[PDB]
Design a protein around this ligand. Structure first.
Ligand SMILES: Cc1cc2nc3c(=O)[nH]c(=O)nc-3n(C[C@H](O)[C@H](O)[C@H](O)COP(=O)(O)OP(=O)(O)OC[C@H]3O[C@@H](n4cnc5c(N)ncnc54)[C@H](O)[C@@H]3O)c2cc1C
Length: 458
């Protein structure tokens, strides 16, 4: 229960576990949505706290899986969290950063701090479901989840996997009048109920030996492309609206032009609300076509990615591909590939294709490959791998290791679109790739200045 007129639509919250309510603070276990503003999970947690006459507190687990990615993501996330600490402190909301995996750490915290209710944000990924299962086994209090990432809650937008954007789109757009709304301000707590710097230091030291380096032993990553945190995210949104949105419709598929929003790293960590971005873009007057194209990406393609992962347990495997694509890829399994590269050769941009290599270098150096070349990149991994299963493994590995926005439903769904035709149709049949949409080098040369892209990233 929340207080009458709290402005919380109950369709945004799902019970994970019934239990017996305790009398202490409401705990928001923050995971996907690393921000204080425009956060329905935090807002719901505050509202339940107010109804129960207790404070809200935030807990975040610094998990054991950080070593599976790089310094680039760890520093981006933790610097955001340092700013978040302050934001939450200004609302008199304490934040606790627990070192370890959620099952042990969240269970113990709930007991030690006498928590009344536990609330988390929503992610459809396997690792969050693993964590939920272990937490559920370790607690006796009620446990809810709130979809703070999507404009329309994932379980409301559709009751099933949607095979195409054109089947999901009408369902989603029909629910915007209900779910696309302004956020209430977060009410502070009535009274105030190892530092992150130390953790960051220790974590970086553990990651240092696996840092991406050029032949010179100088690091590849350039950390000045995306300043982390809530405040920076808002400035990137504003600069997008002011300077890039007008040309987005025309230039979104030109990797030589900096005309995308550049919001993905911030959206991935939830340092900015996609609902906020949509409210601001909807209000803007910009060139015809650009708003339509942008909203299709941040509403339809982003939210269909959650739909995909939520409703397909095997979202990172061949089995989740559509029947037509599985049958087609199987028919061409024994076709001889034109090249076969090792993971190391792919990783280091050592293929015979200079466009592919440049795309990989953009990823290595900036942590954000242009959206258009991501499609090209993943499709060539299918073409130059022993099997579609190996291609998935390779693409996922590199995406997750090097993209700031990686380890994300958008990645799994984008890779599945690219390699497996998920959310696509059948195209002309070719050897090796069957009926999976093909993106040729020469097609790219016709579409944009390939030589310039290659010069930029070599
Ligand atoms: C092989 C492959 C891998 C990808 N890996 C990821 C990933 O790991 N993480 C990730 O966030 N996106 C991924 N994408 C989707 C997309 O390429 C990025 O979201 C986009 O390039 C991010 O840049 P931007 O924010 O400047 O994009 P903009 O064009 O400004 O779009 C704004 C936002 O809309 C959403 N969006 C845009 N395009 C897509 C799309 N095709 N699918 C789903 N959502 C979209 C994203 O949240 C993005 O931040 C992948 C796509 C492919 C083809």
């Amino acid at each position: 229960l929340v207080p009458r007129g709290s402005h919380m639509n109950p369709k945004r919250i799902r019970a994970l576990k019934s239990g017996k309510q305790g009398d202490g603070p409401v705990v928001y276990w923050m995971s996907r949505d690393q921000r204080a503003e425009d956060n329905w999970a935090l807002l719901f947690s505050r509202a339940i706290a107010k109804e129960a006459n207790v404070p809200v507190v935030v807990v975040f687990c610094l998990t054991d899986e950080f070593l599976e990615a790089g310094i680039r993501q760890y520093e981006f996330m933790l610097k955001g969290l340092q700013e978040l600490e302050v934001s939450l402190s200004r609302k008199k909301i304490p934040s606790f950063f627990l070192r370890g995996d959620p099952g042990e750490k969240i269970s113990r915290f709930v007991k030690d701090y006498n928590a009344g209710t536990l609330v988390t944000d929503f992610s459809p990924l396997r690792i969050k479901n693993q964590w939920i299962e272990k937490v559920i086994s370790g607690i006796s209090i009620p446990f809810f989840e709130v979809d703070a990432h999507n404009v329309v809650p994932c379980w409301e937008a559709s009751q099933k996997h949607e095979y195409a954007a054109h089947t999901f789109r009408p369902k989603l757009y029909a629910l915007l009048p209900e779910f696309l709304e302004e956020f209430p301000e977060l009410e502070p707590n009535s009274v105030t109920p190892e530092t992150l710097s130390d953790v960051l230091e220790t974590g970086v030291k553990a990651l240092l030996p696996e840092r991406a380096l050029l032949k010179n032993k100088d690091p590849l990553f350039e950390p000045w492309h995306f300043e982390p945190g809530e405040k920076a995210a808002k400035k990137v949104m504003e600069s997008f609206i002011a300077d890039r949105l007008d040309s987005y419709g025309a230039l979104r598929n030109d990797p030589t032009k900096n005309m995308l929003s550049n919001l993905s790293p911030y959206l991935h960590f939830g340092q900015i609300s996609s609902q906020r971005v949509v409210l601001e873009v909807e209000k803007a007057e910009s060139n015809p076509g650009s708003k339509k194209a942008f909203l299709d990406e941040i509403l339809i393609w982003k939210e269909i990615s959650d739909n995909f992962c939520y409703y397909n347990p095997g979202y990172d495997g061949f089995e989740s591909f559509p029947s037509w694509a599985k049958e087609s890829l199987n028919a061409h399994r024994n076709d001889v590939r034109s090249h076969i590269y090792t993971l190391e050769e792919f990783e280091a941009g050592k293929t015979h294709d200079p466009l592919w290599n440049a795309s990989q270098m953009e990823l290595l150096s900036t942590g954000k490959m242009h959206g258009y070349t991501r499609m090209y990149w993943a499709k060539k991994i299918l073409e130059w791998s022993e099997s579609p299963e190996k291609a998935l493994e390779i693409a996922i590995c590199l995406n997750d290791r090097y993209e700031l926005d990686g380890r994300d439903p958008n990645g799994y769904a984008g890779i599945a679109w690219s390699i497996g035709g998920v959310h696509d149709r059948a195209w002309g049949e070719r050897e090796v790739t069957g009926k999976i949409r093909y993106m040729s080098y020469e097609g790219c040369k016709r579409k944009f200045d390939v030589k310039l892209y290659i010069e930029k990233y070599s």
